[PDB]
Amino acid sequence: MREIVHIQAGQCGNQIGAKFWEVISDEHGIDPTGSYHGDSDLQLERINVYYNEATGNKYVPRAILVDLEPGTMDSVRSGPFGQIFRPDNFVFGQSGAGNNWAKGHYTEGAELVDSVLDVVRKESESCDCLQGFQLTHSLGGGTGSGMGTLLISKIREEYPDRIMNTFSVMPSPKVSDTVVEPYNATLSVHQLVENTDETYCIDNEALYDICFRTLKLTTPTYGDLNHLVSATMSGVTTCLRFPGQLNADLRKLAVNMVPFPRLHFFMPGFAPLQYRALTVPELTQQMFDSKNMMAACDPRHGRYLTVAAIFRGRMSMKEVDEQMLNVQNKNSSYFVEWIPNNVKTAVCDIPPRGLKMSATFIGNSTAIQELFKRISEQFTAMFRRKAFLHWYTGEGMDEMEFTEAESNMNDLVSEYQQYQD
Amino acid sequence: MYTFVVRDENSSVYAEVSRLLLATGQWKRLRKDNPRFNLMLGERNRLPFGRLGHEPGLVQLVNYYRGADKLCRKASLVKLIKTSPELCTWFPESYVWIYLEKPLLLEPGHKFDIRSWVLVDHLYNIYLYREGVLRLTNHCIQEEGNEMFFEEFNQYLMDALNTTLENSILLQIKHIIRSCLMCIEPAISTKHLHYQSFQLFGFDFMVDEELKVWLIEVNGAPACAQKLYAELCQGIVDVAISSVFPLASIFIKL
Amino acid sequence: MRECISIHVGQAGVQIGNACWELYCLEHGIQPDGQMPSDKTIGGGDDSFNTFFSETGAGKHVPRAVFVDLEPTVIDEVRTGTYRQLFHPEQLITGKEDAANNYARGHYTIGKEIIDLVLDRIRKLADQCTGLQGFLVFHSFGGGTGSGFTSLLMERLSVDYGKKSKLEFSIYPAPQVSTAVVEPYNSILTTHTTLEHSDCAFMVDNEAIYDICRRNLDIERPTYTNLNRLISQIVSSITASLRFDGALNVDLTEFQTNLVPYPRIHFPLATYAPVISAEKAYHEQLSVAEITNACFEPANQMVKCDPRHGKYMACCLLYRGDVVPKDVNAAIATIKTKRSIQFVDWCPTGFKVGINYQPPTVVPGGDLAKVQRAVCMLSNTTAIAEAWARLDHKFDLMYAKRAFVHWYVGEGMEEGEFSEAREDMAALEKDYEEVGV
Amino acid sequence: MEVIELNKCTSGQSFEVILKPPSLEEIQKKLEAAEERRKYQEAELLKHLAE
Ligand SMILES: Nc1nc2c(ncn2[C@@H]2O[C@H](COP(=O)(O)OP(=O)(O)OP(=O)(O)O)[C@@H](O)[C@H]2O)c(=O)[nH]1
Ligand SMILES: Nc1ncnc2c1ncn2[C@@H]1O[C@H](COP(=O)(O)OP(=O)(O)CP(=O)(O)O)[C@@H](O)[C@H]1O
Ligand SMILES: Nc1nc2c(ncn2[C@@H]2O[C@H](COP(=O)(O)OP(=O)(O)O)[C@@H](O)[C@H]2O)c(=O)[nH]1
Ligand SMILES: C#Cc1cnc2ccc(O[C@@H](OC)C(=O)NC(C)(C)/C=N/OC)cc2c1
Ligand SMILES: [Mg+2]
């Protein structure tokens, strides 16, 4: 029945996680008590992809909530849709991870991970046919980053043949909690290279630039950053959540999007970012515009291996097609010529709430190499001087392991440069 | 914005055509093996016609007509004339020999040939370029450059024979161009094809001492006369390219 | 009377199966509950429609079909459709999760788990056959099931029914109509593996069907229902000889015998006219001469290509409707003069004509108008190699960078089966070339 | 232009107009070889995950 299991880990993971569930619960007609109160069955046709149906015909997110501190998960349990998650599926410890990847992966989180895998096992076993996993987390702290990638390593061992996708918030010095963020992100990326099928790269710098420059928000909060991530995750998952779409599951999608195992880090985009609805040309122009991209990379600095785009609302399919075929046939220099017909498009009649038309974009571009170059530079700047390393060697890690994370990401970056040529 | 590729860099003619296309600002040149193109200046041999007209939302045109080699190979042309129910009074017997023993001779000097450039557009309109050239009479072997253009040859025919170029020679040339191209049309026309063709042709003619015009051969990849490159290559863009891809007469239609 | 068993594999195969059996029922006067008032042989008969339907004591007429998909959502619609009452459940076989557009997954990984079950359900049908002619297999080149599990099934049918003929109806992939980037791989893989096990294959290019739908039916964005209803007209024209009284193409052996001189070159081009919009109130009824001339227009072909630049090895005209032999020869006389119909030298320049008097049936409410006469032309022309040339070129682009290869090798396939398959296709293209120029 | 081999019935007629003369063991081995390459690859994964 194409069930997906959702995990959200740490402060950032659970906050963008909670919003994702607010947004898609609204679209599916599910109220903050789990009772369905919508008007179309289109809303219910794929409701079991993300929701278990509990006993009194309530719907319960198939969602596991994970953190090493109680503080953000008491927040969730107290927000608008707090009551909707299954109480057993809150798994937390008391110690924290202190923004420390080694505490998340090796010490603190190791204590807690078996208990998460117990909930995951119990959600999986009730799945008619489990389609794969999705994980929300940041890469810059400790729980979502270090324990998050520890979970993925363990889920692979236990379900080596299911798809594992992540929505991963990349740190930026312009929106920063601590200096050690590049250390945690570099160790995190190496895990993701080996252990996920798809990673949506959400750069916190780009999210901030979008609120500041485009949305005209002079002082953006995480709330404002997260509102963008939420709307993008809702778009991305439309073809899975709504009927009549492509007869495709996570594995089919992953196959068509990832031409090479390690090159699976994607740039998401969204349009529009008002009462004037956008014409189909306006959507197609904004969607491919650099300013609408959430990985703070210039697509005119690399080449698209594959692109997928969904349009939501009531609009001409032929018109979506002419515009899409106009964008490609005008900048053919930015798509690789050796994957024929590598741009794919869909329309869904149901638009997002508060909007008449929208476009969500998913691009496997070699420009993403710019993001790993950025993290790699921040990393080396500190690591040459072994700055801040004591926080990590105090938890049992060795310098050798940093060198290897640095080397694998440098590898990854040059692997992208091989294909942009 | 229109996209076009280039796959025949040796083309004396189409180097000037792609040169003009860029100077309009509305045409953009792609890589030779990019398939998301509108127009193609294709290669002379093994040009991949079976891959044209399958790109969603692209109207594709090419500067060659698949099947036109029948006319342009010396061997094939003989076969074409002999086995066509049309066709024959203007083509020398073909299988002293090579051969026309009594050629009209320019004076002074006591032999020449006439090159006409014909352009056939996607609609199969037949366009004869106004300017021909008179040139074994070949630049390879050899007026400035042994090339005499139409106005002089006209002036010679008037003063020397009391006749004009149109009357004595050009009615026969138009009749011959139309006969060859009318004959092969059902085999090569792209009127209801999923892609479109045009093509420039170089007809080579002989004139005998009775002012009879004879067909020598038909060139499928013809060069031009340096003096006429400007005029004709612009006429190409006007009649064959922009008539399918419009932006924002030097031809006799036959 | 010899029975024919239809197998539909994967999404495209099952959905086209739907459109066909709906059309067969309307042509044969069988209602959705399987009853057929025309048949007075209650519980029986050796009539020509019993080649495709068997009868129950209760009077129900049951398609000799098997539907197979590696996931359930498509065959589940059959199970709860207008024609749910027609099929025995045993006939509808679904699996858990699909092949994900991965040939290696449909053939190797998933396919191995289900192939014995399928062969057993088919074996059930075969055992109800006094005489068995062979199999008609409907599938897409591009799906992971359609390509991968089909070639496993075709290999096994050659083993388990070695004397029986196998005909193919194959959906050729088109980016207009929902392809994946990997379908050129799957297409070459399945053609290599299946080529020695198929006697005659009819390729349908989705690009062709899609254009005929936009141009002739004036449907801006055609749906699969639009496409399949048009595809099932062509299929019905091809299988009508098997379901009706007649003397042309009356068993599956005649298809190979009439259309396929060389075993490998077994892909006849299908051309069909007229396709007339049903919202077109006042339309003029095209003549025999007119619909026959239309068979030589590239734009009515099931596969876009230019037969003028090829050579024919066989041609068969199948008319339905108001058509007498006099008009056909009339029409042919005229087209010999105006069209480029070059035959290979070691072959007669002729036409096998079959006329069925019952005019084409159309789905009530469909977008296809009822015509008084239609034709389907089946011709084995080397021009169809153009479709191979396109596919092989896309394969070569991706494969030169090994793009997506890792998804196949991760399923137990070896990289060298990619090049074994592409060498087969280079050979096939060269065969058409030796024959054609 | 000749018309040979004409057959007529009540449903229609047919004719020809000439215009001008002139193993289970091997499948088992391949399927199981692929299953053992899958299995060998999954063992390298679990080895690597154990390291
Ligand atoms: N004409 C037509 N084409 C179809 C239909 N369904 C899919 N296709 C085409 O077939 C190809 C995809 O193959 P599918 O049939 O969906 O794949 P599959 O066999 O089900 O195998 P899986 O990968 O396991 O899903 C694409 O080229 C589609 O355009 C249909 O009902 N009609
Ligand atoms: N039957 C004939 N009688 C007189 N002169 C003839 C002749 N056939 C050829 N010629 C001479 O040969 C010259 C051109 O030869 P021809 O056209 O047959 O080969 P070509 O070198 O032009 C091939 P292409 O034009 O494709 O490069 C003419 O200038 C003409 O003088
Ligand atoms: N977009 C976004 N980023 C966040 C949020 N909370 C933290 N971050 C970012 O995530 C990183 C800090 O990691 P965090 O999730 O808070 O720590 P963790 O609990 O140990 O996993 C930093 O790069 C922050 O910029 C949030 O709600 N939204
Ligand atoms: C969770 C999760 C998830 C994981 N991986 C995806 C890959 C592609 C994707 O794509 C949609 O993004 C708009 C989409 O609508 N895809 C269409 C156009 C239907 C087909 N794409 O063919 C590649 C969605 C995905 C959603
Ligand atoms: Mg924090």
Ligand SMILES: [Mg+2]
């Ligand atoms: Mg499928």
